[PDB]
Amino acid sequence: MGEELTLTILRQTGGLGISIAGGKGSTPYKGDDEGIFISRVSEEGPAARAGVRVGDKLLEVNGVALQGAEHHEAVEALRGAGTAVQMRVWRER
């Protein structure tokens, strides 16, 4: 069980303040799940302020779907994401 949330990261002057992990065909971050996950959130950064949490599974970035994605596809999505990053996540309870 869990919930889906869409968080909006408002970038400031210190970067997004997250790390992402996982992806199809590489070592799973969590169990045998090959999804993209949030593996780090900087405490003082804008992702923390928006409400993103470690362990959130990343479903979309600015509406671009990442279900079944390889790691580099999520990296590319975040690189292109701009000043306000809308991040749809699944948060296991």
Binding site: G14, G15, L16, A21
Partner: peptide, 11 residues
């Protein structure tokens, strides 16, 4: 090709 646990940081 990167292998293992892939983690990419956006500081």
């Amino acid at each position: 090709k990167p292998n293992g646990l892939l983690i990419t940081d956006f500081p």
